[PDB]
């Protein structure tokens, strides 16, 4: 009933059917992680039984952790790849976008799945639920999750999309960290910096391929790290810079300032990474 292919109920497919449907295509899973020692093990454990079956590859992309993220992820059997290791010829910039962009060079799967590493008790059918529409459908090259409280999503991302790309008004969670896409699409698109990366991929995919190429899947309920409002403001600012730029609007480049009563300025970036294709 939406112009967008939307699975509302627990998808039907079994692990075996999904695996059959691959037909020579490979699947990489990527867990970006910055200081997530309390949750990383459980996220890995939820996925690693799929490895050498439905999933051909799982990595943790460690984004500069100074806690025990790497040693715990290793103890869980995971290959852990630093930003450095992932693309050593290019100096490292901070932010999630960079980490995901670099993960394209550390993986070789025809389909790439992203899952956040701060999730509290993730379901082991997250990945199968997400590759469903890529594997069985035709035309689909991006799958976003939705769930059941997304303050930045509900107050910033979705109202700005109603304002400037109303066609995407039917995406329920445009900022979701859990999503899958073809390598062909991801290495052809630029990667916005920091927390701008999801909203950039969504709009560029739509602008380049239209809605027919985009699916969304219910993953149930989502629980993750709840962050203080001051941190979310910084995030929101980067979401706005990236969204305005994709819509042709000039962004000042001036970072958000907050007065807690003292003055702090958060970084914002107007620099995207290019399509990973150009690094061939």
CB of 37 to ligand UPG, least distance (A): 11
How far, in Å, CA of 278 to CA of 173, rounded? 30
How far, in Å, CA of 60 to CA of 39, rounded? 13
SS3 category, 252: coil
Query: Which of 38, 92, 105, 170 lies at the binding interface for a second copy (CB under 8 A)?
Result: 170
CB under 8 Å, gap of 24 or more: what pairs does 169-174 form? Answer: 170/2, 170/3, 170/4, 170/6, 171/4, 171/144, 171/146, 171/202, 171/214, 171/216, 172/146, 172/216, 173/144, 173/145, 173/146, 173/147, 173/216, 174/144, 174/198, 174/199, 174/202
Query: Which of 210, 257, 274, 277 lies at the binding interface for a second copy (CB under 8 A)?
Result: 257
34 is an interface residue for ligand UPG by CB under 6 A: yes
Question: CA-based Rg of the chain, rounded to a whole angstrom?
Answer: 18
246 is an interface residue for ligand UPG by CB under 6 A: no
32 is known to lie in a ligand binding site: yes
How far, in Å, CA of 20 to CA of 40, rounded? 29
118 is an interface residue for Mn ion by CB under 5 A: yes
18 binds, among Mn ion, a second copy, ligand UPG, none (CB under 5 to 8 A by kind): none
118 binds, among Mn ion, a second copy, Cl ion, none (CB under 5 to 8 A by kind): Mn ion
CB under 8 Å, gap of 24 or more: what pairs does 87-94 form? Answer: 87/279, 90/279, 92/64, 93/193, 94/64, 94/194
Nearer to a second copy, 16 or 267 (CB): 267
188 binds, among Cl ion, ligand UPG, Mn ion, none (CB under 5 to 8 A by kind): Cl ion
How far, in Å, CA of 82 to CA of 50, rounded? 23
117 is an interface residue for ligand UPG by CB under 6 A: yes
Query: Which of 15, 38, 51, 244 lies at the binding interface for a second copy (CB under 8 A)?
Result: 244
Q: Which residues bind ligand UPG (CB under 6 A)?
A: 32-34, 36, 63, 94-96, 99, 116-118, 175, 177, 195, 198-199, 224-225, 227
Binding site residues for Mn(2+), as ranges? Answer: 118, 224
Q: Which residues bind a second copy (CB under 8 A)?
A: 8, 149, 151-152, 154-156, 158-160, 162-164, 166, 169-170, 172, 229-230, 232-233, 236-237, 240-241, 244, 249, 251-252, 254-259, 261, 268
Binding site residues, as ranges? Answer: 32-36, 63, 96, 116-118, 150-153, 195-198, 222-227
């Amino acid at each position: 009933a939406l112009p967008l292919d939307t699975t509302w109920h627990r998808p039907g497919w079994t692990i075996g059917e999904l695996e059959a449907a691959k037909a020579g295509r490979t699947i990489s899973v990527v867990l970006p992680a910055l200081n997530e020692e309390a949750t990383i093990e459980s996220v890995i454990d939820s996925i690693s039984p799929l490895v050498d079956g439905l999933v051909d590859e799982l990595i943790v992309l460690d984004s500069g952790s100074t806690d025990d993220t790497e040693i715990r992820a290793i103890a869980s059997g995971a290959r852990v790849v630093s930003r450095e290791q992932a693309l050593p010829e290019v100096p490292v910039r901070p932010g999630k976008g960079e980490a995901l962009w670099r993960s394209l060079a550390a993986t070789s799967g025809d389909i790439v799945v992203f899952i956040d590493s701060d999730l509290i008790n993730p379901h082991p059918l997250f990945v199968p639920w997400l590759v469903g529409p890529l594997l069985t459908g035709e035309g689909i090259q991006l799958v976003k999750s939705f769930y059941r409280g997304g303050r930045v999503t509900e107050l910033v991302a979705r109202p700005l999309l109603a304002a400037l790309r109303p066609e995407l008004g039917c995406v329920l969670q445009p900022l979701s960290g859990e999503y899958a896409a073809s390598r062909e699409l991801l290495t052809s698109l630029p990667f916005a910096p920091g927390y701008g990366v999801e909203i950039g991929l969504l709009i560029d995919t739509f602008d380049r391929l239209g809605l027919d190429a985009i699916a969304q899947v219910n993953l149930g309920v989502r629980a993750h790290r709840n962050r203080p409002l001051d941190e979310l403001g910084a995030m929101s600012r980067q979401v706005i810079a990236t969204l305005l730029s994709r819509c042709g609007i000039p962004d000042s480049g001036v970072g958000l300032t907050q007065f807690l009563y003292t003055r702090h300025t958060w970084p914002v970036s107007l620099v995207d990474r290019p399509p990973m294709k150009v690094m061939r």
